[PDB]
Amino acid sequence: RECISIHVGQAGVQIGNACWELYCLEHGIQPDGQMPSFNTFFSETGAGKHVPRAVFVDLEPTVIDEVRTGTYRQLFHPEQLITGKEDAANNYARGHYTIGKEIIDLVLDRIRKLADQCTGLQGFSVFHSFGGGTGSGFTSLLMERLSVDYGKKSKLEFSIYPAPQVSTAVVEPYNSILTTHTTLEHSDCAFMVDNEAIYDICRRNLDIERPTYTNLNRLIGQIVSSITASLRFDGALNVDLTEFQTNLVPYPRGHFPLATYAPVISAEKAYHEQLSVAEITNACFEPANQMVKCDPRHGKYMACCLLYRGDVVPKDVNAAIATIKTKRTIQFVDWCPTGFKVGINYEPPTVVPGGDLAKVQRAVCMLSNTTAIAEAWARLDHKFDLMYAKRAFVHWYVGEGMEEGEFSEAREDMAALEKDYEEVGVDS
Amino acid sequence: RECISIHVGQAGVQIGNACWELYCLEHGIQPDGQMPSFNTFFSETGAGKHVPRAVFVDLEPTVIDEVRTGTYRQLFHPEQLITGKEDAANNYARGHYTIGKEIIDLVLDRIRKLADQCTGLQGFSVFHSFGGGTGSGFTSLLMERLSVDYGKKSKLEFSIYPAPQVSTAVVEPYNSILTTHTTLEHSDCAFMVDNEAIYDICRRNLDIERPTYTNLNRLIGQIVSSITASLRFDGALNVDLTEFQTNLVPYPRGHFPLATYAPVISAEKAYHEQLSVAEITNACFEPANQMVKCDPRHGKYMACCLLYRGDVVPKDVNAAIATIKTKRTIQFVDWCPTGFKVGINYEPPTVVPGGDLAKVQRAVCMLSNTTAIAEAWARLDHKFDLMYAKRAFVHWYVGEGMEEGEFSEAREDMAALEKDYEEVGVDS
Amino acid sequence: REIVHIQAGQCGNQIGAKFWEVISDEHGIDPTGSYHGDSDLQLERINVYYNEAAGNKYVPRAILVDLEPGTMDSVRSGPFGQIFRPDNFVFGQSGAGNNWAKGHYTEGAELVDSVLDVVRKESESCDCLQGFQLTHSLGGGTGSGMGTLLISKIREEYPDRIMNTFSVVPSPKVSDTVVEPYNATLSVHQLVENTDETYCIDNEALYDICFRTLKLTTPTYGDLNHLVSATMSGVTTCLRFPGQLNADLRKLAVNMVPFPRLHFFMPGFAPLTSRGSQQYRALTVPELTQQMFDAKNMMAACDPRHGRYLTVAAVFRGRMSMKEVDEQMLNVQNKNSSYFVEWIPNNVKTAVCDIPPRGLKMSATFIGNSTAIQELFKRISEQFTAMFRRKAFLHWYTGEGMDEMEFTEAESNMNDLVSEYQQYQD
Amino acid sequence: REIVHIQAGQCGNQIGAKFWEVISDEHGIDPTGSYHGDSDLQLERINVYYNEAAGNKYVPRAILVDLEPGTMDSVRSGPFGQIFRPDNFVFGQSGAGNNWAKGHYTEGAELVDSVLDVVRKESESCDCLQGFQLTHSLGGGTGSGMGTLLISKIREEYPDRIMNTFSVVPSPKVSDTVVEPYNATLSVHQLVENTDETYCIDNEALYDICFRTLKLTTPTYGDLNHLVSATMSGVTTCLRFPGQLNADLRKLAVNMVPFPRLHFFMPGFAPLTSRGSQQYRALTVPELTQQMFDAKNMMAACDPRHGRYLTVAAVFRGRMSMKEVDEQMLNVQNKNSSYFVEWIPNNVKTAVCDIPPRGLKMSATFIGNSTAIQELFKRISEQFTAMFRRKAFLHWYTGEGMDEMEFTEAESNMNDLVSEYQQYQD
Ligand SMILES: Nc1nc2c(ncn2[C@@H]2O[C@H](COP(=O)(O)OP(=O)(O)OP(=O)(O)O)[C@@H](O)[C@H]2O)c(=O)[nH]1
Ligand SMILES: Nc1nc2c(ncn2[C@@H]2O[C@H](COP(=O)(O)OP(=O)(O)OP(=O)(O)O)[C@@H](O)[C@H]2O)c(=O)[nH]1
Ligand SMILES: Nc1nc2c(ncn2[C@@H]2O[C@H](COP(=O)(O)OP(=O)(O)O)[C@@H](O)[C@H]2O)c(=O)[nH]1
Ligand SMILES: Nc1nc2c(ncn2[C@@H]2O[C@H](COP(=O)(O)OP(=O)(O)O)[C@@H](O)[C@H]2O)c(=O)[nH]1
Ligand SMILES: [Mg+2]
Ligand SMILES: [Mg+2]
């Protein structure tokens, strides 16, 4: 019943920092590993120290060093903290090939070591970003190997969705297009969120006009914990990760369920307001709490999964579902009946001490696969096209051995993906 | 069994401030919402805090800020307090169209949220003023949407009737004429009062020669509470809001019942004087307590509703009615028999601590639809005409997209309304 | 929600010196820049006129403009010249010399580009502008000349913001520049159609008030500009602070302008009497209304009872009853019905603020738009014609390229305003 | 992970004198060589620029090169000249005299072998080089002449390391050498294709900034080179210290170069204003972005709004929100969309470091690659042509064997960069 977390790149690792901090908060784990009390994620020592079963990869020493100098440096095993010396430079060509390919063997052997520590490997999940060099480059490299060795294990990916308006990486389209090509075909499911959309959540629901990544990742951590800690904890409907895959992936392509999370409420907003299960789920179908800037009303739904924490009575859930099925404007694709996975954990929602979110007594996470995602690809299509037509920055990949045909090909694979969304949109 | 109050504009909000203060006084509600003890208006939290189901709209931050900094800032939910940045400028053209139309969607969604919080929405009522920019402009905009979504719910409006002698808004005729056009057709019933008439009440019955709006709105609040708090409380004849509509609106046009309220008595005037139910109702048919400067003796009655608080015995009421039917000079229109709605609540009348009105043991509110209202329209007709003939101030509307034909049209609609009053006056 | 103010010309710069002083008084802001008040309201709406700079420093949202460093320096040298940032001092070198052509048409025109750039920087610093205000003289070179140029460009950039200005109108007796009516004529030609509203201040009238009711025998321009700032500050504070009525500048503009072209105002102020009598005065609403209606308490050398009143605004500061205000305004309307225009029913409008001016219990600002205003235009137009025929000093102006036909059109336009006042005088 | 810096020419040597001073300031390293700081970070990433020698001595990883001992001596004589080891002073005897031919082609060429040997010794001392940086003047003999020669050999030895250089670009008004455009032309011919990137510093622009915004009336080159070092140090510290964004020099290079040949940069810097106004400034992200975008705060005598922006890098130092930075950069992109090139979506990229420069709360470095840069090339090329036809001082150069056809090709190559900027200016 075990799983492995993999943190690649800054985004992967810094999100991971929040994630493991939250898992410590879930059980009262001390920075040194001492836990007085979740062995699905952790491995126990004779001292009662538990080791989070995870791998941290950075090709630049700095971020891992940040871990190594922080409080959780005692928690993590030195072998889990893997670092190279040089970067990918925002570039798949080095991340996947030239540079990252050198260290990956080590990385894999640490993974395999942990796989041998697992007794019942259920699977794993990889945290990264769609635009970066290691964030997406190295990441796909890893998938190429992991899908061989662990072909039957859960291969869930979580990635930051490139913001349409702000991006620090000029060749991000190129990176992301190459990842599509290689991740679609290897991964089982990839989830993503938009930091821009999140900012809007922070300013509207948390009332914060100063979000940093350390805020943004707390919110992400919430979502992740709902599906990682609480799915291993007790509930009414205990849903596994393999079950998630078995209930969220409808086609052999990928699919890309997007996250939505409600409650996201400031402490003051929690006052004077009573949420019910149904009210929270109402919020879950509002564009306003959509974690990716993509309009839910534009597309049609294919999948939807609702996962519940704390004070949730199935009775209320059932009523809530009835209304979301019938009251809303949620259009859905023919193919699908509304079999929405309901996970119901008794495990209460948790809050980070010193965080922004209010203590809540119940909480709902929503995953959804909508046809509007093709528009996200359309965004990438043109951004890629523009660059590629001019061949701007192309020498930074070509010099590492990339082929122009390959890039065209990858775009075409994306186009095919868009076409399949088109297909799904056609009802039948 | 629930309802929504809507406060638009200063007039709407400041009156609302008095109204919600009175509801707090009705049950002992603390500024923070803590009530130790009326859930038709309020929504309960697990802390025992209750939230008044109401929406506050101001396009200028200031008045809402006044709420936000006062004691009742703890009572109101931050989402109920909606504010824009700029004003309508006394002008329908911006209030209904250019400016207010931008924020209204938010406003509506907060309303809808509350509508979803309601389990049995009976209806709602809107507080505003016939002359202002948001007071009447925005207001009608709202009705345009609310009448779609809540077509079968009570749509009662309360508005300040423009004083014939004092008005601070030079284009008030124009504003009010445009509202006629758009409110007549959408609303169910609109009530109104004249601050000038009220001043006369304050100086003659309360003996106060220094009324401010904060006095004036207390008196309005009294009237409103009689029909809002006490109609949900217990009585002999428990009358609902829908019942009010069903008992006050005779035609599909609008109608405009005017308020009259007796007792309005200073503490010293209460001494040495014993009011009975009958005596109070005698006062109710006196011009002297008429809340609008319009002569009751001029027109003919069409509707009349009497609502009773405290120590009222139907026995006495019956006798009182007999005398008002036969003793008075009240002429009434043929169409109507004297079926005057009698609401009889055991719920006693309440008084604002530090207010002007004397503690009374019984009280009567009167609503009435008289043909004299056409004279009020005549006032507007000429005021509008004068301005419109010269085309004074017309550029302040035209520049926002208003049409001159439209203005003519709106006047004509008023003329038609006057003609229908003429019609009713003709007995048949 | 915010306002930007630009001062120009020696007049405008010295008026603004008092204006800003008062605004900081209103909010408890020290001459050095920090806030040392003591009321919540004092900081609460400070945004309209101040930017809070790091360190709890408040920067007045205004630009000081001139073409001679020395005037600017003298402003800077006093208290509150330190509160202005150096970046708000935009000036050239060599005067204008009270020459419209230099100011507007040629040389001053050159500076305007740098002024406007700073204006833009401030427009960005604001969250949401309500409008702009400018202070200047109608017969001056930079005051009107350069100032007008600036206005035409600001209006262009922000059609949707309030553009108003207060300006010193050449008094019948004291003109300084021989062609002061010429400059004024040209400014009408440019300003009237490039502004939402303009206020008419006559120094002569001001000197009469200061001795007539205030019984003072030593005023300077700083004392008279105090009175000016009282009216200016009166207007905007209400907008800033909590009141009862309707406290928005744009709404004021809407209520005071019946016609696109006739937007000239006669400011007045109450209470405004000497200390001796202060022991014999009573403070009531009728008391303020008596002072407000009385033409001698007007700051414009006009006579409202000679003309007809189109619009009247009565702004009140401090706690007053609504009833009393309503009744007294009605009474005014009633008793002075012979001066009001019949086309506008209830031509007297009110605005009420609950915050009194520091040191007083109550106060009121009179704003009027009468037809009487046309008399000032008539005086100028006439004087202009005489000069026009002789070309007095027009070689200076034509030497800088100003064409006489432009002036001819300016003359017409003055006459047009008069005819339109006649058209609504009836 | 480490960087080697080489300074050359009187300019380069004096700039480096300030650069290294600052780096040691950043890390608390004393003028004598030992570490006396007080922050963990100060030693933590010291490796990029210092070798710790026995005794807790830090050796700056740089070579000081000249052909006159006296300049070297003057450098050595001040604080921080003692921190450099004697082995890093490589120099000859007899000038160059600001002669490319001597520097590159003949005499200075002789010294380069000894320089390179030391370079090799240091390349071995590093664990892993990230790259190299050189400081020099484009129109100087050793600065550009000898320096260029060195660069071509270093690049040859390390194709895989970053090769960049910062160089003083002949200002339109102050050229010292009559053939300064000639030397510059030759350096373009050699450098552009033998470097990954070069920065364009104009002293004239720097002198304007120091008086324009900093309001200073006494600067020297040490004060202006302070500003230069602010930008240089700004870049590498982030790479050194913990941040939020992506703090790698190579990644910067990748994001800023869309085309193999167009790698010229316009540095700028914020905040950068006089103390007077510091009491009237607010420290926000938009504040920094206002200073960063403004062309007057550029250190290059160009005008980015004249040309088109290909790439923009915004580097931030200190605690800022991600949101605010993202939004303001977006706003910039939005409002200045007319200057950005349409081929690159979201052409403004950011980098964020959480360590502020000593003494400031926040700071930002502007790096741009516009087409406007071509104007500098055009000025030089033109001046060159005139001289070329006359052979001014070319007997000195041809006397040392420099052939005119090589110069002819150099001219073409300048023109080629301009045409390529035009090719992407569109
Ligand atoms: N939510 C979130 N997004 C982040 C975080 N850090 C970076 N990102 C986003 O991820 C992308 C940045 O990737 P980089 O940090 O440049 O690169 P990397 O993927 O770590 O790998 P390299 O390019 O080789 O350094 C941008 O789109 C950022 O907005 C973080 O802590 N949280
Ligand atoms: N009874 C009562 N009447 C009020 C009150 N406030 C204002 N009024 C009246 O309502 C009208 C004023 O409307 P305004 O305050 O100008 O405007 P508004 O309707 O709030 O909206 P805007 O014009 O956009 O500011 C006048 O006829 C006033 O006499 C109040 O508190 N009580
Ligand atoms: N109220 C008032 N008027 C002033 C002041 N200064 C100059 N004036 C008037 O302005 C006119 C002269 O214009 P001036 O301001 O010198 O023009 P400029 O300086 O060239 O723009 C005369 O009518 C003066 O009475 C002042 O400080 N207050
Ligand atoms: N910023 C700056 N420029 C300098 C310095 N020294 C010389 N320069 C510039 O460099 C050019 C002269 O080249 P120089 O450095 O004497 O050449 P070299 O010494 O023979 O290599 C002129 O354009 C000067 O403005 C300096 O310390 N700082
Ligand atoms: Mg990284
Ligand atoms: Mg209002």
Side-chain angles (χ1 to χ4, degrees), chain A residues 114-146:
Chain A
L114 291 174
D116 289 346
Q117 293 302 311
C118 293
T119 65
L121 181 64
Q122 300 310 144
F124 57 83
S125 178
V126 181
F127 295 85
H128 67 86
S129 173
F130 284 121
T134 61
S136 69
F138 182 91
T139 297
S140 59
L141 178 64
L142 179 60
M143 290 301 296
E144 191 181 295
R145 297 286 180 273
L146 292 177

Side-chain angles (χ1 to χ4, degrees), chain A residues 10 60 85 167 199 209, chain D residues 1 127 244 323 326 349:
Chain A
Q10 283 175 233
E60 158 60 53
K85 294 182 180 179
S167 175
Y199 290 148
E209 292 291 331
Chain D
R1 298 302 82 184
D127 181 67
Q244 297 299 308
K323 178 177 180 286
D326 289 347
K349 310 304 188 190

Side-chain angles (χ1 to χ4, degrees), chain A residues 9-10 14 88-90 129 132-135 160 195 213 217 220, chain D residues 246 251:
Chain A
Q10 283 175 233
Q14 289 300 357
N90 200 18
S129 173
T134 61
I160 302 300
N195 290 344
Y213 290 123
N217 295 342
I220 292 170
Chain D
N246 44 93
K251 182 165 169 177

Side-chain angles (χ1 to χ4, degrees), chain B residues 9-11 58-60 63 87-88 133-135, chain C residues 244-248 251:
Chain B
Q10 283 175 233
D58 196 335
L59 299 181
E60 158 60 53
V63 172
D87 283 314
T134 61
Chain C
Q244 297 299 308
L245 297 174
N246 44 93
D248 186 86
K251 182 165 169 177

Side-chain angles (χ1 to χ4, degrees), chain C residues 121 124, chain D residues 285-295 297 328:
Chain C
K121 287 181 166 67
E124 182 64 23
Chain D
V285 172
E287 177 66 29
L288 291 172
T289 63
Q290 182 61 51
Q291 292 184 42
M292 292 174 73
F293 194 80
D294 192 334
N297 295 326
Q328 188 59 356

Side-chain angles (χ1 to χ4, degrees), chain C residues 281-397:
Chain C
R281 300 304 178 189
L283 302 176
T284 67
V285 171
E287 177 66 29
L288 291 172
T289 63
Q290 182 61 51
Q291 292 184 42
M292 292 174 73
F293 194 80
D294 192 334
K296 71 183 50 60
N297 295 326
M298 298 294 102
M299 306 298 176
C302 304
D303 182 344
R305 60 179 176 182
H306 182 70
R308 301 188 70 193
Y309 289 94
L310 293 172
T311 60
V312 177
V315 179
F316 296 95
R317 291 172 293 270
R319 300 291 187 184
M320 304 180 194
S321 67
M322 294 299 98
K323 178 177 180 286
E324 187 181 346
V325 171
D326 289 347
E327 287 174 327
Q328 188 59 356
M329 290 295 94
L330 181 59
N331 289 336
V332 170
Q333 180 177 311
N334 289 343
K335 291 180 180 178
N336 292 286
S337 66
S338 67
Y339 303 119
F340 292 110
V341 175
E342 62 278 8
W343 299 114
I344 301 171
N346 297 338
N347 50 57
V348 179
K349 310 304 188 190
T350 65
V352 178
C353 319
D354 293 325
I355 304 302
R358 184 182 182 185
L360 302 177
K361 182 174 182 179
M362 62 184 70
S363 175
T365 298
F366 181 90
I367 301 171
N369 188 342
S370 174
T371 65
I373 292 168
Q374 73 191 307
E375 194 64 23
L376 292 173
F377 296 168
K378 183 62 158 52
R379 294 290 80 74
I380 292 169
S381 180
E382 290 165 336
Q383 290 175 79
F384 174 91
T385 299
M387 290 189 290
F388 184 75
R389 290 186 289 102
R390 285 296 299 175
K391 303 179 187 298
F393 295 81
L394 288 178
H395 69 294
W396 289 127
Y397 284 45

